[PDB]
Amino acid sequence: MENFQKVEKIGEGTYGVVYKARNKLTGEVVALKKIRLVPSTAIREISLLKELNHPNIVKLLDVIHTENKLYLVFEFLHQDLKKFMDASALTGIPLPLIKSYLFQLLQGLAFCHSHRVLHRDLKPQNLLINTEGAIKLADFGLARAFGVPVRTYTHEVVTLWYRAPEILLGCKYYSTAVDIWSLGCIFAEMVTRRALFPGDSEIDQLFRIFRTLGTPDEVVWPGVTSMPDYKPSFPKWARQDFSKVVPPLDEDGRSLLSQMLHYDPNKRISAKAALAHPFFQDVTKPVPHLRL
Numbered sequence: 407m408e409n410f411q412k413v414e415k416i417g418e419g420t421y422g423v424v425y426k427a428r429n430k431l432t433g434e435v436v437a438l439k440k441i442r443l444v445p446s447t448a449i450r451e452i453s454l455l456k457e458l459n460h461p462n463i464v465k466l467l468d469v470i471h472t473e474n475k476l477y478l479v480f481e482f483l484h485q486d487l488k489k490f491m492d493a494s495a496l497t498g499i500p501l502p503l504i505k506s507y508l509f510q511l512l513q514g515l516a517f518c519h520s521h522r523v524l525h526r527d528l529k530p531q532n533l534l535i536n537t538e539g540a541i542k543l544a545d546f547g548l549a550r551a552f553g554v555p556v557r558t559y560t561h562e563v564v565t566l567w568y569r570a571p572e573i574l575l576g577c578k579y580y581s582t583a584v585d586i587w588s589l590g591c592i593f594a595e596m597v598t599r600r601a602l603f604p605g606d607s608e609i610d611q612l613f614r615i616f617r618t619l620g621t622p623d624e625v626v627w628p629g630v631t632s633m634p635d636y637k638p639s640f641p642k643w644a645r646q647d648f649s650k651v652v653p654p655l656d657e658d659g660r661s662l663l664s665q666m667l668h669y670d671p672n673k674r675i676s677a678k679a680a681l682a683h684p685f686f687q688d689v690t691k692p693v694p695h696l697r698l
């Protein structure tokens with residue numbers, strides 16, 4: 407830590423305070439993350455993430471285990487998508503830019519997933535943008551390392567808006583399809599300028615999902631009725647047309663959103679397959695209008 411000078415508190419993450427900081431020797435400007443509670447297991451797992459390098463993954467520069475505390479030093483980026491969407495509310499992110507960002511995030515998932523590494527807590531606050539038209543995933547792999555708590559260290563509620571339904575139904579064993587689902591929800595949110603499923607508890611989240619996509623059953627999701635927190639007593643809602651759910655998204659876009667939104671995680675499109683989807687045939691890399 408003494409090798410850093412804290413420029414400023416950026417905010418309060420899942421695990422702890424996030425600082426913008428300068429390496430007190432090397433000049434480099436970085437994101438510094440203190441991790442609350444170190445266990446041998448988390449070290450070895452964190453250390454596997456330093457090698458998981460990709461242009462659409464926020465680079466983990468260094469892990470520091472000293473004084474029995476744990477800091478993570480990250481490539482610094484100046485804005486997240488949550489804030490960028492807020493800034494863009496009056497007219498929406500232009501579709502060519504939504505496509506570029508989606509395309510790039512799928513590239514980063516496709517990388518991590520091929521090495522068997524999931525995010526598990528994708529969300530706008532976790533997706534970070536620069537002035538070059540790029541977008542990157544933060545905190546990849548940290549959920550397996552440390553868990554995902556209900557409240558942060560500052561009791562701030564961790565949002566459920568982007569959580570896949572197999573998790574909400576108590577499935578113990580997640581696959582990579584959970585990130586696809588989150589990303590699907592983020593994709594719908596960029597398009598409509600409104601969160602898809604803003605639940606404020608687990609059941610409100612589940613039921614919000616149900617009301618839009620239909621209560622899942624053994625037809626669409628084999629094995630569903632036998633998941634840990636499934637209850638025969640769930641209300642049975644009918645599914646809504648996607649045309650109602652995300653206008654004015656185009657046919658290709660709606661078609662892809664649907665596959666990213668499949669109940670059965672096994673049926674849910676992979677990142678790699680999704681990059682091949684006709685939605686992305688005219689993809690480009692526009693530069694965002696950023697005010698820092």
Ligand SMILES: Brc1cccc(-c2cc(NCc3ccncc3)[n+]3[nH]cnc3n2)c1
Nearest residue numbers: 417418419424437480481482483484485486
């Ligand atoms: Br709080 C919180 C929760 C999850 C991720 C991050 C960030 C933000 C960020 N920069 C975006 C901002 C946001 C606001 N002010 C300055 C930079 N990062 N750069 C590199 N890792 C980062 N992790 C912060």
